[PDB]
mmCIF file of C-alpha atoms and ligand atoms in Angstrom:
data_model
loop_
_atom_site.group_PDB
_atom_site.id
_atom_site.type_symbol
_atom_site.label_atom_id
_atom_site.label_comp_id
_atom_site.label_asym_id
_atom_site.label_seq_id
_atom_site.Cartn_x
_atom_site.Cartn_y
_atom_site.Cartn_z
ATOM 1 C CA UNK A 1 85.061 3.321 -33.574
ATOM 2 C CA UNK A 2 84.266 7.361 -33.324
ATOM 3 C CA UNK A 3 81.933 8.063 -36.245
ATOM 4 C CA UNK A 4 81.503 11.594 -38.157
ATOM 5 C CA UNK A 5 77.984 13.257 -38.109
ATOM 6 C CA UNK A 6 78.153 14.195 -41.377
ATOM 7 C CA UNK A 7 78.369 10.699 -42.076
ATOM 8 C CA UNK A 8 75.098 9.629 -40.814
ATOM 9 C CA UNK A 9 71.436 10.391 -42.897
ATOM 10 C CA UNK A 10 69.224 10.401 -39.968
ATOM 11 C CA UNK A 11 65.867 8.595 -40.890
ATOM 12 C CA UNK A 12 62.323 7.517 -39.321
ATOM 13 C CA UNK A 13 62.379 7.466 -35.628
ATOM 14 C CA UNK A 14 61.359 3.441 -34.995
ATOM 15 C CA UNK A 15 61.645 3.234 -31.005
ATOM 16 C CA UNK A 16 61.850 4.939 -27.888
ATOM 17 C CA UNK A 17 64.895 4.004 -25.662
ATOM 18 C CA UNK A 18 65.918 5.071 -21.808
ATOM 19 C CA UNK A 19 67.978 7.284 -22.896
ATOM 20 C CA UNK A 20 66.652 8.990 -26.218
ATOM 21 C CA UNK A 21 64.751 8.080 -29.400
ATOM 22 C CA UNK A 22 65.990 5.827 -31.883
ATOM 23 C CA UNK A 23 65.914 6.340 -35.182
ATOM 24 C CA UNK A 24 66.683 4.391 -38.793
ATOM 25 C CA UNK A 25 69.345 5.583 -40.912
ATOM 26 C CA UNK A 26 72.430 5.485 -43.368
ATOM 27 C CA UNK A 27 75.995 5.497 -42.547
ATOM 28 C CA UNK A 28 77.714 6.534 -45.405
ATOM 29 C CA UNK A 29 80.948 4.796 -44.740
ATOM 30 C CA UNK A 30 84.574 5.475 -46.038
ATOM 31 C CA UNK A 31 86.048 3.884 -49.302
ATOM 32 C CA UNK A 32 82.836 1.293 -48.800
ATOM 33 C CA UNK A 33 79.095 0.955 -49.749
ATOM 34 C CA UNK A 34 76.759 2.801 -47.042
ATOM 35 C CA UNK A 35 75.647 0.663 -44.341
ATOM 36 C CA UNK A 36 71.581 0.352 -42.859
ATOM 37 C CA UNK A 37 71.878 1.554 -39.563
ATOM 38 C CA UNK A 38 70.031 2.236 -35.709
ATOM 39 C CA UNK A 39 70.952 5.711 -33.916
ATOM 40 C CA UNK A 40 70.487 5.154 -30.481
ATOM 41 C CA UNK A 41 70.090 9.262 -29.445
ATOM 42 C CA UNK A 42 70.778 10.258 -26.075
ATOM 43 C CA UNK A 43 68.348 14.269 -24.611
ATOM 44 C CA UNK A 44 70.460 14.406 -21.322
ATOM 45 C CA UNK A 45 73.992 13.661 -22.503
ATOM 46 C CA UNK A 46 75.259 17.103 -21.189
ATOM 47 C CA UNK A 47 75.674 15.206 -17.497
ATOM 48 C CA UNK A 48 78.677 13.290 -17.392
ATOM 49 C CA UNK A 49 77.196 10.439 -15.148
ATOM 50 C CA UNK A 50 74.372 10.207 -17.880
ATOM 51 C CA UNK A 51 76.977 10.317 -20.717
ATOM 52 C CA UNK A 52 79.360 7.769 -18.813
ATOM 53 C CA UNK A 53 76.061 5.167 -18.508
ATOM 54 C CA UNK A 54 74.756 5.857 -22.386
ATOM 55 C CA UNK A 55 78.191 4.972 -23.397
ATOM 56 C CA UNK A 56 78.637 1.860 -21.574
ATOM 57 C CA UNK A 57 75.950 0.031 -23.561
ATOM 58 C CA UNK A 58 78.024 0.739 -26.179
ATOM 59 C CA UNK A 59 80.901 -0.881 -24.568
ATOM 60 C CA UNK A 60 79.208 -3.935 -23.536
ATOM 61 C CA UNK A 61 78.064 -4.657 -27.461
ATOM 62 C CA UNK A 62 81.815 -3.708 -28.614
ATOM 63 C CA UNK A 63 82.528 -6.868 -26.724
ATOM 64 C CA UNK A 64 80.263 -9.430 -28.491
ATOM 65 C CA UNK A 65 81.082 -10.485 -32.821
ATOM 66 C CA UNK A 66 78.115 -12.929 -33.526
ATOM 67 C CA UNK A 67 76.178 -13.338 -36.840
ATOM 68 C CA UNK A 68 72.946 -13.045 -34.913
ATOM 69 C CA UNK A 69 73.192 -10.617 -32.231
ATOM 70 C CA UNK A 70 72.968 -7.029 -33.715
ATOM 71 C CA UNK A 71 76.340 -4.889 -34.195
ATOM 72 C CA UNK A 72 77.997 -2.077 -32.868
ATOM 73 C CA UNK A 73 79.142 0.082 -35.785
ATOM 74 C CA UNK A 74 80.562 2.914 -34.171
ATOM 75 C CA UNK A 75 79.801 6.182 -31.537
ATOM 76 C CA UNK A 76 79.348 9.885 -31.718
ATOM 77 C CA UNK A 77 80.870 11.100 -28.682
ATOM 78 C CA UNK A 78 80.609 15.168 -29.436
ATOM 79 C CA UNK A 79 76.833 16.290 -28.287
ATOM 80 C CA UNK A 80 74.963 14.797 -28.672
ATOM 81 C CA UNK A 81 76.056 11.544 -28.332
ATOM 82 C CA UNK A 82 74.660 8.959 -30.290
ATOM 83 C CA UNK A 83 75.218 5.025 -30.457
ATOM 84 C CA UNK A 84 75.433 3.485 -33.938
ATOM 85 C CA UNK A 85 74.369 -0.079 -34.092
ATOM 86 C CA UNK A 86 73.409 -2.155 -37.675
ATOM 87 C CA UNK A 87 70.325 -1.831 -38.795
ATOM 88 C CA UNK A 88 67.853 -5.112 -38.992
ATOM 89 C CA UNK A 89 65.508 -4.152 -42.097
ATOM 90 C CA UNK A 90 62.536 -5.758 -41.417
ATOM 91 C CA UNK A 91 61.802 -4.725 -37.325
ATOM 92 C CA UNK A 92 60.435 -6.481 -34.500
ATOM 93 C CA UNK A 93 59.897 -10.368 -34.316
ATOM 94 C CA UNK A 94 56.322 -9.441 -32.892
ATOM 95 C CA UNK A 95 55.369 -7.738 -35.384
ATOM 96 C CA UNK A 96 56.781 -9.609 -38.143
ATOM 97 C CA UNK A 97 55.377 -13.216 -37.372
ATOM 98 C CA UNK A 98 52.015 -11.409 -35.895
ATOM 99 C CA UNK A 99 51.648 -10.075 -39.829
ATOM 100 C CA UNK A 100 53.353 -13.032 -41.980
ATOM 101 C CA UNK A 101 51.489 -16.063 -39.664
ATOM 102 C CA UNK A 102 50.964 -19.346 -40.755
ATOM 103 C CA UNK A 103 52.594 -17.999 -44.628
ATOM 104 C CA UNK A 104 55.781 -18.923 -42.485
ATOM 105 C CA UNK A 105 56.437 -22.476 -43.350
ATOM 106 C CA UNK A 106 57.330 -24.489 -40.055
ATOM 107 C CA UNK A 107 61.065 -24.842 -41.186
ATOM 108 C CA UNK A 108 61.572 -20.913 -40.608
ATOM 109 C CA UNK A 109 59.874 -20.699 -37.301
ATOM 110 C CA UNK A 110 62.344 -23.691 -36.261
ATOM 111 C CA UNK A 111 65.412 -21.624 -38.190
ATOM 112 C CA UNK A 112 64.452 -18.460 -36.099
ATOM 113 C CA UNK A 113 64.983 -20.649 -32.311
ATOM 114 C CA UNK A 114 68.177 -22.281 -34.058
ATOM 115 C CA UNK A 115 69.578 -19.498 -34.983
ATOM 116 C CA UNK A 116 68.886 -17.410 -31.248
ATOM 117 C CA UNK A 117 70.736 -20.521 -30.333
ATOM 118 C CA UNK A 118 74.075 -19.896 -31.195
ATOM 119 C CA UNK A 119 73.799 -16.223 -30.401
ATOM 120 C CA UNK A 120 72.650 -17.808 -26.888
ATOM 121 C CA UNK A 121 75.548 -20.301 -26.981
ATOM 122 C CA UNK A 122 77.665 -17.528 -27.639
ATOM 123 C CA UNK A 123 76.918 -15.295 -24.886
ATOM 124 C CA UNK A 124 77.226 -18.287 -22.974
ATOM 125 C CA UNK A 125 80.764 -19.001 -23.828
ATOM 126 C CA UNK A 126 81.136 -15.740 -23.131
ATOM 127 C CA UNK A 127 79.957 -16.337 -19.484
ATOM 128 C CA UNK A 128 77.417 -13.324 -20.465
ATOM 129 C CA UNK A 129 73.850 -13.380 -18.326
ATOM 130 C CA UNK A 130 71.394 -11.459 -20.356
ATOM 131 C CA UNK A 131 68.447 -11.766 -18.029
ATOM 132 C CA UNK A 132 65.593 -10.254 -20.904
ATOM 133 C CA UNK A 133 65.284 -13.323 -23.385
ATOM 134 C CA UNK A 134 61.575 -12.288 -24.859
ATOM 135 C CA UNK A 135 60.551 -12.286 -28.543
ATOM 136 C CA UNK A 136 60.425 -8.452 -27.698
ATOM 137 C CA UNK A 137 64.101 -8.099 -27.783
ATOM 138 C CA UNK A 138 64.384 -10.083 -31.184
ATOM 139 C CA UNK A 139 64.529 -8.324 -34.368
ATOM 140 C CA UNK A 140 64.387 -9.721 -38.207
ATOM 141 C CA UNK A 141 67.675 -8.927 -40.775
ATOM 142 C CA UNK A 142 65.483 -10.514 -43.024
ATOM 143 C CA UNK A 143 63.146 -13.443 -43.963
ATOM 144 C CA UNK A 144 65.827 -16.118 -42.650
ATOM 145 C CA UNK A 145 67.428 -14.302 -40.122
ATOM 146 C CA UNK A 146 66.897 -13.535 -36.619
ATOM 147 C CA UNK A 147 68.994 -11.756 -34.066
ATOM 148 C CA UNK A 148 69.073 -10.313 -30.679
ATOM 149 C CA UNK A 149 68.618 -6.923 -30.375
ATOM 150 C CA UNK A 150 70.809 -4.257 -28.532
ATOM 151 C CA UNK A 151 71.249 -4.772 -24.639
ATOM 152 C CA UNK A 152 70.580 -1.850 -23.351
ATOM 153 C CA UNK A 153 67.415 -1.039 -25.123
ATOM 154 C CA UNK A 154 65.909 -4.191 -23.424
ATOM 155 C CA UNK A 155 63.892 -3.276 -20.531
ATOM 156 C CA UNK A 156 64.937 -5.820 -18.251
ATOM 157 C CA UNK A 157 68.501 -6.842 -17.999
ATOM 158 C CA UNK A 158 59.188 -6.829 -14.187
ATOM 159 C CA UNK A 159 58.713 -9.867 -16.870
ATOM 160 C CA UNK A 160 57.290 -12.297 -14.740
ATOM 161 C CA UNK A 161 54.914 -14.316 -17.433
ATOM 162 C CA UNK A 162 58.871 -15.179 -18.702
ATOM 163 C CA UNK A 163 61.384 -15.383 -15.720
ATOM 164 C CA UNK A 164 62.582 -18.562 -14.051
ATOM 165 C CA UNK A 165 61.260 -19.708 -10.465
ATOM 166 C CA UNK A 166 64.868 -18.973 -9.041
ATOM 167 C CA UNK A 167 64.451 -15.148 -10.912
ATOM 168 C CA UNK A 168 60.903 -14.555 -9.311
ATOM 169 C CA UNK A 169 61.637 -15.386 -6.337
ATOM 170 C CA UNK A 170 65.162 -14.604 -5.068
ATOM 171 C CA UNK A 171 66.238 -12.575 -8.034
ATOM 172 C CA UNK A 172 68.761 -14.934 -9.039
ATOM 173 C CA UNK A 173 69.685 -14.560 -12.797
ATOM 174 C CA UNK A 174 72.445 -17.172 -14.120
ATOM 175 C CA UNK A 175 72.925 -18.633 -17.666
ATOM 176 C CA UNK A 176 70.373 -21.940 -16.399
ATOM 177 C CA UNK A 177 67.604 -19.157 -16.281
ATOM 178 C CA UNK A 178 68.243 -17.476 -19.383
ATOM 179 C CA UNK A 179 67.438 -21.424 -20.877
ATOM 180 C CA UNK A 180 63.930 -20.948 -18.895
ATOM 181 C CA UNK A 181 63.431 -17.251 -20.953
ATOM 182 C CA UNK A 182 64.650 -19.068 -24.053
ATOM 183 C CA UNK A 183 62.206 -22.051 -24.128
ATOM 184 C CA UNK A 184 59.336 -19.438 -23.264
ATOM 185 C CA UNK A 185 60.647 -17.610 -26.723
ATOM 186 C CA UNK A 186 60.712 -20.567 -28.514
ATOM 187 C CA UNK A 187 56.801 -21.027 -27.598
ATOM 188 C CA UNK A 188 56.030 -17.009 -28.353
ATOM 189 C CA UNK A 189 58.123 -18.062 -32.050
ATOM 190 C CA UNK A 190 55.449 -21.321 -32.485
ATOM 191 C CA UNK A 191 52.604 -19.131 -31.533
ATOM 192 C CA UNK A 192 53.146 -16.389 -33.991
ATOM 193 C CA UNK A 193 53.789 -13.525 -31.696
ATOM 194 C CA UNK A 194 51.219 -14.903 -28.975
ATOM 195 C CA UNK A 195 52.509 -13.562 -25.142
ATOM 196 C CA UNK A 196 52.258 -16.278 -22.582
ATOM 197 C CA UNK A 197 49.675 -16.704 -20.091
ATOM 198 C CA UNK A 198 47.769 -14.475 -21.769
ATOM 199 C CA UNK A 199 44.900 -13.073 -19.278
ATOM 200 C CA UNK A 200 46.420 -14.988 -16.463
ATOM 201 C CA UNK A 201 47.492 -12.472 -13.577
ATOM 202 C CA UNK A 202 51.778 -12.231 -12.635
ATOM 203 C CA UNK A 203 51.088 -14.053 -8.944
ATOM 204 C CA UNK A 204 48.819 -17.100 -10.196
ATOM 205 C CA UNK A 205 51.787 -17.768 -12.540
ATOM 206 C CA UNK A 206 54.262 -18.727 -9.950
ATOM 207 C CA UNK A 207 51.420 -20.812 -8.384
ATOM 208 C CA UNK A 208 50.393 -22.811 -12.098
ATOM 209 C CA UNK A 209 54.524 -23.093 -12.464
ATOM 210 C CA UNK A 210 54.692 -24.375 -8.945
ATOM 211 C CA UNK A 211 51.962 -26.874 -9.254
ATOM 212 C CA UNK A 212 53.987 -27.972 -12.514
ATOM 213 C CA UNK A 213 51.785 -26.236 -14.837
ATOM 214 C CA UNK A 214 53.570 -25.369 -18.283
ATOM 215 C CA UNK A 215 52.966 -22.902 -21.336
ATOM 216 C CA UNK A 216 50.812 -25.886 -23.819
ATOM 217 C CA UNK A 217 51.960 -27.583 -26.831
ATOM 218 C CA UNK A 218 51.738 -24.897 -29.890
ATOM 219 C CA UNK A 219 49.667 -25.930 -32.860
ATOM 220 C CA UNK A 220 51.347 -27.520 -35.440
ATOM 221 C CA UNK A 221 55.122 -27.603 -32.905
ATOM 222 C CA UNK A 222 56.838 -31.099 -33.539
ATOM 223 C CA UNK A 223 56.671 -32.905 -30.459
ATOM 224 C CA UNK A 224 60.734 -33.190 -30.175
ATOM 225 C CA UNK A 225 60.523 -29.084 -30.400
ATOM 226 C CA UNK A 226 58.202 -29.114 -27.847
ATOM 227 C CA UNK A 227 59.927 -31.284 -25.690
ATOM 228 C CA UNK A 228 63.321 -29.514 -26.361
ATOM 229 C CA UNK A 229 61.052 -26.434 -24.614
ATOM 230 C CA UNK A 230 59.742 -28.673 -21.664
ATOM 231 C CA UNK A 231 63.726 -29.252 -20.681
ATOM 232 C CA UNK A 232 63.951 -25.634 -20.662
ATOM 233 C CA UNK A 233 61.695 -25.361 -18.128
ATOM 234 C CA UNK A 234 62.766 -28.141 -15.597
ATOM 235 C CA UNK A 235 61.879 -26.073 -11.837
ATOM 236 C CA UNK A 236 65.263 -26.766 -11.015
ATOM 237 C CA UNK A 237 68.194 -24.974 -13.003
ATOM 238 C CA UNK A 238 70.790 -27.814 -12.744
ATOM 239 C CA UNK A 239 68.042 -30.095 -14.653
ATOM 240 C CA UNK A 240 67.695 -27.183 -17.641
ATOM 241 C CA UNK A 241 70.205 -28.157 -20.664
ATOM 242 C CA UNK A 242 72.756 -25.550 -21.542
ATOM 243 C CA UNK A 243 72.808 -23.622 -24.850
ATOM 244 C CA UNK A 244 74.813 -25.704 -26.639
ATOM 245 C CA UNK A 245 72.734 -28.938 -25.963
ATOM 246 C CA UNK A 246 69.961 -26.529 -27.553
ATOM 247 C CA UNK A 247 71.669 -25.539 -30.708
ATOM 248 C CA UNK A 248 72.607 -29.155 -31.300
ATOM 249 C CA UNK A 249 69.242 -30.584 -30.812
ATOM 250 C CA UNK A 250 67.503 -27.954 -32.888
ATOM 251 C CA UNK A 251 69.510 -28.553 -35.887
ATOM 252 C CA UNK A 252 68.689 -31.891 -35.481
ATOM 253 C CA UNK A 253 64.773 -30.271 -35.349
ATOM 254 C CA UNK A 254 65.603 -28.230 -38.046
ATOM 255 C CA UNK A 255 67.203 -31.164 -40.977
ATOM 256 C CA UNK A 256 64.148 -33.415 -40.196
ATOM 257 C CA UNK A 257 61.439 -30.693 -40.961
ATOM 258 C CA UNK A 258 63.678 -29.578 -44.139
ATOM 259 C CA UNK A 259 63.946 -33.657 -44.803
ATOM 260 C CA UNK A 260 60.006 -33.918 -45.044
HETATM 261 C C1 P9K B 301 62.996 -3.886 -29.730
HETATM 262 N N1 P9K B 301 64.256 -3.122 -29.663
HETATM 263 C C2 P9K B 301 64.161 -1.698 -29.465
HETATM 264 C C3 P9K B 301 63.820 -1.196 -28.209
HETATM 265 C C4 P9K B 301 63.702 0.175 -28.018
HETATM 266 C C5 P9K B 301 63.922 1.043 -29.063
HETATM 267 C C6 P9K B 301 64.250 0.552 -30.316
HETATM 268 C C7 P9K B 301 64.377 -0.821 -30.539
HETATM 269 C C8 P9K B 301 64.730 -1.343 -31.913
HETATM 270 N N2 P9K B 301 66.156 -1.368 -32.216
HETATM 271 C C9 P9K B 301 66.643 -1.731 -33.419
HETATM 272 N N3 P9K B 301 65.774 -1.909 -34.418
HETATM 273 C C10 P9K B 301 66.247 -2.396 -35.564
HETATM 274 N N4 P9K B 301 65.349 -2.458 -36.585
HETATM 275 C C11 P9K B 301 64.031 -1.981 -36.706
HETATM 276 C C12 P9K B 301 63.616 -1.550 -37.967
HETATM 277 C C13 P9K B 301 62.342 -1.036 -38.156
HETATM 278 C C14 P9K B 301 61.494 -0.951 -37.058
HETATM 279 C C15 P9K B 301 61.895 -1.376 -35.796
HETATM 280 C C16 P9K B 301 63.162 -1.908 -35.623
HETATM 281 C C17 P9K B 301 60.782 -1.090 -34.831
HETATM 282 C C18 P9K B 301 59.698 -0.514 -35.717
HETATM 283 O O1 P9K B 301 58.564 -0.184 -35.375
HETATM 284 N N5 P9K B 301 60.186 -0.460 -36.986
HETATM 285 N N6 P9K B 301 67.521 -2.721 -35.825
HETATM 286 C C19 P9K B 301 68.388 -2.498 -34.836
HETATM 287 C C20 P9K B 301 68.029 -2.000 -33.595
HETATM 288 C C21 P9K B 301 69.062 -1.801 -32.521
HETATM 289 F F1 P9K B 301 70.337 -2.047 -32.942
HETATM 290 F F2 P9K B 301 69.018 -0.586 -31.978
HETATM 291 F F3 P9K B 301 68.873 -2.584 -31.517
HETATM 292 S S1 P9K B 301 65.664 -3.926 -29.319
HETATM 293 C C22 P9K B 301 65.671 -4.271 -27.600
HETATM 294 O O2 P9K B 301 66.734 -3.023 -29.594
HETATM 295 O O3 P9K B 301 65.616 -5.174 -30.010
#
């Protein structure tokens, strides 16, 4: 797992973390082909409380082996200290669908959801919380593939216009609420990049969601998608289907839009 500097061609800096800047770059593996990869950099590694809490999110992404939640290649743990996690080519989901739009054919805007699925599903098994599901935190390997980016360069694991009631208001984050965070990035996936509740201010939210107010149907969403999202966000948690309910029905989602 320790990596050799002299084995890294440090690239384009493509993010700002807590911790450092984070760049794109090649790791020029042993006896293999070089690798795409994400330097997580770390200013204020010199502290050994700072160090100790940089290298932890390292840690917690050694623990996880999932096709769509991004990698933990290795660390460089002389100063300074850098995390090196796969790279995912083409950036941001944002970004991505906000440029490619409606040129994405329904079928890979279903594909994208399925596919955060089973990374979902697998933090689940994993009896993993992850408390930040956003479209923000997903990046794109390529055209038809999606995966969760790193953990600790998520802001949040306050996001309000995405949290469950039970979050908002007595901070209570299980796997049931992560479903709530999940069906609000399946809508932000339908709407190309759109945020939710757009102009709508943080404390009228809890009021509309309250009231039984819900994010509207997307243009062009299959109703069974949209009512796959609507389960999501039952108000109470024990009503919310679990992750692997999810994957199932979106494959099911997924074959019928293929099928036509
Ligand atoms: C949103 N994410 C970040 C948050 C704070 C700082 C950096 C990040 C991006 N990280 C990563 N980015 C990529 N690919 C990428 C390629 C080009 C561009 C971008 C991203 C952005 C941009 O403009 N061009 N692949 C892997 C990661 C990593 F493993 F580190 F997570 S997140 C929570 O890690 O998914």
């Amino acid at each position: 797992y320790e990596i050799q500097r002299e084995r890294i061609e440090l690239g384009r800096c493509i993010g700002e973390g807590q911790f450092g800047d984070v760049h794109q770059g090649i790791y020029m593996s042993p006896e293999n082909p070089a690798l795409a990869v994400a330097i997580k950099t770390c200013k204020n590694c010199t502290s050994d409380s700072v160090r100790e809490k940089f290298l932890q999110e390292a840690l917690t992404m050694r623990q996880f082996d999932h096709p769509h939640i991004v990698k933990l290649i290795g660390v460089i743990t002389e100063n300074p200290v850098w995390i090196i996690m796969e790279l995912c080519t083409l950036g941001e989901l944002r970004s991505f669908l906000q440029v490619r739009k409606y040129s994405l054919d329904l079928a890979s805007l279903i594909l994208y959801a399925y596919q955060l699925s089973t990374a979902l599903a697998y933090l689940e098994s994993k009896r993993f919380v992850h408390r930040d599901i956003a479209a923000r935190n997903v990046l794109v390997s390529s055209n038809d593939c999606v995966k969760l980016g790193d953990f600790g360069l998520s802001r949040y694991m306050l996001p309000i216009k995405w949290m469950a009631p039970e979050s908002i208001n007595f901070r209570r984050f299980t796997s049931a609420s992560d479903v709530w965070m999940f069906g609000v990035c399946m809508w932000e996936i339908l709407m190309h990049g759109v945020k939710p509740f757009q102009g709508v201010k943080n404390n009228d939210v809890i009021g509309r969601i309250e009231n039984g107010e819900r994010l509207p149907m997307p243009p062009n969403c299959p109703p069974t998608l949209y009512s796959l999202m609507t389960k999501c966000w039952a108000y109470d948690p024990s009503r919310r289907p679990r992750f692997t309910e999810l994957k199932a029905q979106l494959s099911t989602i997924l074959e019928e839009e293929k099928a036509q």
